[PDB]
């Protein structure tokens, strides 16, 4: 079982990838 | 009262159905209606494109009623640790919905209403200033 810190970093990682696709920096 | 409530429920059912049908044709009932289903769609797309990673992370959730708030809070505060963006906001909604689904799966339906409150407060007190600075939800809809 991965700790909450890992869950959150993974969630933020893919949230960022999704953001970068749609939104200008 | 119960008489008024049946009238209100009928009206809500109509508005819900018409809102849906409008949305299927690229139209909308109202600004709030457009936001709601841009968010639904964005969450679906996020969960679809990142199905492997999102499935994986949600599979790691360990929920009990006495630790649920602590978990919700640590995850969302880490998600936004180095700032906010629209993708992180979608991730936040997706995560809350996953938390709810996990809770019902595990016979902890009681947590559903709690999670909704925790999310609404988070929007009010953590995320609203950024959202307002970044053109509000209408900007998310355009984006």
For residue B85, give the 3-state DSSP assignment: coil
CB distance B90–A18 less than 8 Å?
yes
CB B63 within 8 A of CB B108: yes
**Solving technique for this entry?**
X-ray
Q: In the structure encoding, which two tokens stand for residue B99, read together? A: 């938390």
Q: What is the resolution of this structure in A?
A: 1.8
The percent helix, strand, coil of chain A (3-state, each to 5) is: 75, 0, 25
Task: State phi, psi for B141 to the nearest 5 degrees.
Answer: -60, -50
Question: Where along chain B do its domains lie?
Answer: 1-143
CB B90 within 8 A of CB B43: yes
Which residue reads 């970044």 in tokens?
A: B134
Spatial distance between the Cα atoms of B92 and A12, rounded to a whole number of angstroms: 9
Which residue reads 């016979």 in tokens?
A: B107
Question: Where along chain A do its domains lie?
Answer: 1-25
Spatial distance between the Cα atoms of B138 and B140, rounded to a whole number of angstroms: 5
CATH code of domain B1-143: 1.10.437.10
Q: In the structure encoding, which two tokens stand for residue B29, read together? A: 């009932």
CA B119-B29-B135 angle, 5° bins: 55
Nearest CB neighbour to B60, from listed A7, A13, A23:
A7
Taking alpha carbons only, the member of A18, A5, A19 closest to residue B79 is: A5
Which residue reads 């949305």 in tokens?
A: B23
CB distance A4–B74 less than 8 Å?
yes
CB distance B87–A18 less than 8 Å?
yes
């Amino acid at each position: 079982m991965r700790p909450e810190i890992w869950i959150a970093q993974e969630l933020r990682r893919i949230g960022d990838e999704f953001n970068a696709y749609y939104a200008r920096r | 009262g119960p008489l008024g409530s049946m009238s209100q429920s009928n009206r809500e059912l109509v508005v819900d159905f018409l809102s849906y049908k409008l949305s299927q044709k690229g139209y909308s009932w109202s600004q709030m209606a457009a936001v709601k289903q841009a968010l639904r769609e964005a969450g679906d797309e996020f969960e679809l494109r990142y199905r492997r990673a999102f499935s994986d992370l949600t599979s790691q959730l360990h929920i009990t009623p006495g630790t649920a708030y602590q978990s919700f809070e640590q995850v969302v505060n880490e998600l936004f640790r180095d700032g906010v963006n629209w993708g992180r906001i979608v991730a936040f909604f997706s995560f809350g919905g996953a938390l709810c689904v996990e809770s019902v799966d595990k016979e902890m339906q009681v947590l559903v209403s709690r999670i909704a409150a925790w999310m609404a407060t988070y929007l009010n007190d953590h995320l609203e200033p950024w959202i307002q600075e970044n053109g509000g939800w209408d900007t998310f809809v355009e984006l």
